Enzyme design. Structure first.
Site, mmCIF file in Angstrom:
data_model
loop_
_atom_site.group_PDB
_atom_site.id
_atom_site.type_symbol
_atom_site.label_atom_id
_atom_site.label_comp_id
_atom_site.label_asym_id
_atom_site.label_seq_id
_atom_site.Cartn_x
_atom_site.Cartn_y
_atom_site.Cartn_z
ATOM 1 C CB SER A 117 -0.939 -0.018 1.212
ATOM 2 O OG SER A 117 -1.983 0.939 1.057
ATOM 3 C CD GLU A 221 -4.875 -4.792 -4.438
ATOM 4 O OE1 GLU A 221 -4.889 -3.889 -3.578
ATOM 5 O OE2 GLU A 221 -3.904 -5.558 -4.602
ATOM 6 N NE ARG A 226 -7.646 2.526 -15.205
ATOM 7 C CZ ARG A 226 -8.468 2.140 -16.178
ATOM 8 N NH1 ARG A 226 -9.348 1.168 -15.965
ATOM 9 N NH2 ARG A 226 -8.409 2.725 -17.365
ATOM 10 C CG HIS A 253 -5.330 -1.947 -0.741
ATOM 11 N ND1 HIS A 253 -4.436 -1.792 -1.777
ATOM 12 C CD2 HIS A 253 -4.924 -1.104 0.238
ATOM 13 C CE1 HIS A 253 -3.516 -0.910 -1.433
ATOM 14 N NE2 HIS A 253 -3.791 -0.475 -0.216
#
Length: 275
Positions: A117, A221, A226, A253
């Site tokens: 993250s 997520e 992308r 995530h």
């Protein structure tokens, strides 16, 4: 596992570090955006220490640094009453490795930086600028183009929501050089020039039986996937040839998927760092 108090001259305080010995080279396990001051999120949420026990690698889990991006900030976060300036890059690249070398025999060179993250990009930036310290870097669901487009705004929002931290106190206004300096996409030529071994993971937002089935984890997520795919394309186009890119059709995530990747990369780290 040991709980250490490591002085930071640059921050004027002692930093708690959770530490498991087991070899001269170490995996630095960096925390997420909501890092707590008691224990590192890897230890709270995963069996990371158990999984790397007897791996031939030490494991280092620094504690604290909520919303810090493991970077050196320009000034204290103005909005939330922070009374000192975060200097987490100085701590990770100078203060902590010196302390672990002197007292534990952990080598200051030839280590792995693993982030997720918030700290996924941090780990790549650490390897970009400190290649002798970090020949290996992993980014799990990281935010890999923080200077581009709407990302400075989104990062500013998330930091203000997670403890009231001010992204402009960190890297200045968005046109300040610190934004591109700390942008892994921008620094891909450094990763290539260093021949950094990089491990880049991002799920697609669909949970498996591993769990993490909540909307924010699914949304985040899918959002950063992308950017991660663009990073993979730009790395290859810039001559990158030492990367593992894991984009399976699942994952949110959330910690179960990050743990699954930490386990999966163990042999890779062992081969790169120990031979």
């Amino acid at each position: 596992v040991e709980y250490l108090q490591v002085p930071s001259a640059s921050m004027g305080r002692d930093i708690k570090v959770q530490f498991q010995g087991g070899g001269p080279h170490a995996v630095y396990l960096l925390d997420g955006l909501r890092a707590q001051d008691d224990y590192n999120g890897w230890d709270i949420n995963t069996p990371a220490f158990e999984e790397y026990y007897q791996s031939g690698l030490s494991v280092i889990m620094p504690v604290g640094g909520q919303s810090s991006f493991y970077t050196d900030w320009y000034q204290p976060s103005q909005s939330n009453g922070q009374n000192y300036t975060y200097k987490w890059e100085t701590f990770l690249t100078r203060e902590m490795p010196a302390w672990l070398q002197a007292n534990k025999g952990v080598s200051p060179t030839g280590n792995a930086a693993v982030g997720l993250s918030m700290s996924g990009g941090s780990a790549l930036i650490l390897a970009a600028y400190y290649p002798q310290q970090f020949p290996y870097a992993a980014s799990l669901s990281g935010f890999l183009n923080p200077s581009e487009g709407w990302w400075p705004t989104l990062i500013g929002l998330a930091m203000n929501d997670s403890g009231g931290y001010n992204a402009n106190s960190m890297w200045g206004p968005s046109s300040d050089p610190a934004w591109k300096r700390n942008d892994p996409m921008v620094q891909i030529p450094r990763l290539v020039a260093n021949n950094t071994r990089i491990w880049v993971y991002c799920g697609n937002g669909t949970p498996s039986d591993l769990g993490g089935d909540n909307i924010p984890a699914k949304f985040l997520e899918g959002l950063t996937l992308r950017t991660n795919q663009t990073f993979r394309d730009t790395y290859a186009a810039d001559g990158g040839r030492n990367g593992v890119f894991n984009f399976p059709p699942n994952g949110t995530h959330s910690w179960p998927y990050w743990n699954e990747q930490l386990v999966a990369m163990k042999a890779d780290i062992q081969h790169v760092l120990n031979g």
